[PDB]
Design a protein around this nucleic acid. Structure first.
Ligand SMILES: Cc1cn([C@H]2CC[C@@H](COP(=O)(O)OP(=O)(O)OP(=O)(O)O)O2)c(=O)[nH]c1=O
Ligand SMILES: [Mg+2]
Ligand code: NA
Ligand code: NA
Ligand code: NA
Ligand code: NA
Length: 324
DNA sequence: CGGCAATACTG
DNA sequence: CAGTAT
DNA sequence: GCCG
């Protein structure tokens, strides 16, 4: 798939990112969908009218697209606040979002050294800060493989029947991965229970897990672990690792969800909603139960990812095609 | 105009 | 709840 | 930002 509009999307993304770090999330979501619509266009966009014929692109977006197309630049970029580069730096710290970045900025901080020496940091943020560079670079697929295998071997050592699947960008076939997303379950529908505690303690013992970010181990029904790992050996960097354990009945929906992409997911969930259904990482179900939240819908059994697509009347897409 | 995915921890 | 995260 |  060749993005015939790279010259466009490249500029649009700078703006999209600017709105994002400033907290203007809905406006930023709009650009993202516009940007993906452009990447998927069969040819390079050649006119305002044609740009408008594309869903996700309105008059405002079309103006910018044509300006970039015809001038090779977007003047709006020259007007982005000088605070944006700083807000981006701060929000690049895992555990710190736009609100925290803003707070730090207002306090006068402008560099990571400022944050290290004077900023108030949450436990997660302190970990995000010390591993800033490690976490910012995307690791080579080869390393993600090693990480995934490390987790699989440690788990299967407890039960060879356990299925361990690297999801996220690794599953979508990317060449580099921002982190490693591992999903675990068991066909018998019960042997997944209790694996969390044993897996984490096992990986901690061998020194693989170096820090925890999100992990409620007081909960035996715990399904997610967000932490930090590091392969043994010389020169290995620290990497983000997410581990999810789910009962077999939720395997298809968990696999679908954690494979993503994030945009592919919210788009698919939105489609589900229009068909009177609701899609979570747990299951596809009938429309959730005046005009208010209450009870979950009835679950629609889905043994495989294909089943989810089928019940949604959507053509099936391999993981590599959910790159959105 | 209001909605924009559905959900899971932390403190 | 506010914030951040998947 | 866009859509309905
Ligand atoms: C953050 C986020 C994530 N997801 C899903 C779908 C993706 C997986 C993994 O997320 P990740 O950030 O690793 O992304 P990933 O695709 O693995 O890309 P990286 O290489 O990790 O950045 O979770 C989502 O539905 N909504 C979200 O807001
Ligand atoms: Mg990932
Ligand atoms: Na359109
Ligand atoms: Na962050
Ligand atoms: Na992840
Ligand atoms: Na947080």
């Amino acid at each position: 798939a060749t993005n015939h509009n790279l010259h466009i999307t490249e500029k649009l993304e700078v703006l999209a990112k600017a709105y994002s770090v400033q907290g203007d999330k809905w406006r930023a979501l709009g650009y993202a969908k516009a940007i993906n619509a452009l990447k998927s266009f069969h040819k390079p966009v050649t006119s305002y009218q044609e740009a408008c014929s594309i869903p996700g692109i309105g008059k405002r977006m079309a103006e910018k697209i044509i300006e970039i197309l015809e001038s090779g630049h977007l003047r709006k970029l020259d007007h982005i606040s000088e605070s944006v580069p700083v807000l981006e730096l701060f929000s690049n710290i895992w555990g710190a979002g736009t609100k925290t970045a803003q707070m730090w900025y207002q306090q006068g901080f402008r560099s990571l050294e400022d944050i290290r020496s004077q900023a108030s940091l949450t436990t997660q943020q302190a970990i995000g800060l010390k591993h800033y560079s490690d976490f910012l670079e995307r690791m080579p697929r080869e390393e993600a493989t090693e990480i995934e295998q490390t987790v699989q071997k440690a788990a299967q050592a407890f039960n060879s029947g356990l299925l361990c699947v690297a999801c996220g960008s690794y599953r979508r076939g990317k060449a580099t991965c921002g982190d490693v997303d591992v999903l675990i379950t068991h066909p018998d529908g019960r042997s997944h229970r209790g694996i969390f505690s044993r897996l984490l303690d096992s990986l901690r013992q061998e020194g693989f897990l170096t820090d925890d970010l999100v992990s409620q181990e007081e909960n035996g029904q715990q399904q997610k672990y967000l932490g930090v790992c590091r392969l043994p050996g010389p020169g290995r960097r620290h990497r983000r690792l997410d581990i999810i354990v789910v009962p077999y009945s939720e395997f298809a929906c968990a696999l679908l969800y954690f494979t993503g992409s994030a945009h592919f997911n919210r788009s698919m969930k939105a489609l589900a909603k229009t068909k009177g259904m609701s899609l979570s990482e747990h299951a596809l179900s009938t429309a959730v139960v005046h005009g208010c939240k209450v009870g979950p819908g009835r679950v629609l059994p889905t043994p495989t990812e294909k089943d989810v697509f089928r019940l949604l009347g959507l053509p099936y897409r391999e993981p590599a095609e959910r790159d959105w």
